[PDB]
Design a protein around this ligand. Structure first.
Ligand code: 79C
Length: 113
């Protein structure tokens, strides 16, 4: 009943639910939680990536309605992908996995009424 802004935010909630769901778990799982640079022994990760982002953080912020509009939500989802492209070798499996998940994201986002 509140119009397009409310509807866009609800649609974004749904995109996020889909990205976190079992449907995409073959490629989305590296993006469920913040990169644990200590556990992964990535001693240069936080020197290269200045603004880490991941789907659990997007969920915390979206559920708290910290994104004022759909573009703000998209910016953080795309930051997550961009961090992966920036840090990792371009032929790495994890870059292909980020790309598979971004194909889903961009498709759903483009079809937001
Ligand atoms: C428990 O989680 C993992 C476990 C294993 C795992 O189980 N690895 C090995 C354990 C020991 N040997 C035997 C081989 C598998 C590998 C990766 C994991 N998780 C992860 N999450 C996120 C990123 C990532 N990884 N990336 C990968 C690239 C290659 C090494 C980290 C680089 C990155 F920079 F952090 C990045 O951008 N992303 C998005």
């Amino acid at each position: 009943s509140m119009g397009k802004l409310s509807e866009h935010l609800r649609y974004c909630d749904s995109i996020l639910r889909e990205m976190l769901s079992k449907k995409h778990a073959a490629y989305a799982w590296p993006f469920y939680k913040p990169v644990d640079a200590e556990a992964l022994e990535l001693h240069d990760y936080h020197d290269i990536i200045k603004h880490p982002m991941d789907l659990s953080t997007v969920k915390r912020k979206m559920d708290g309605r910290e994104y004022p509009d759909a573009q703000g939500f998209a910016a953080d989802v795309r930051l997550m992908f961009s961090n992966c492209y920036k840090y990792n070798p371009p032929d790495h499996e994890v870059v292909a996995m980020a790309r598979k998940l971004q194909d889903v994201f961009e498709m759903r986002f483009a079809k937001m009424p």
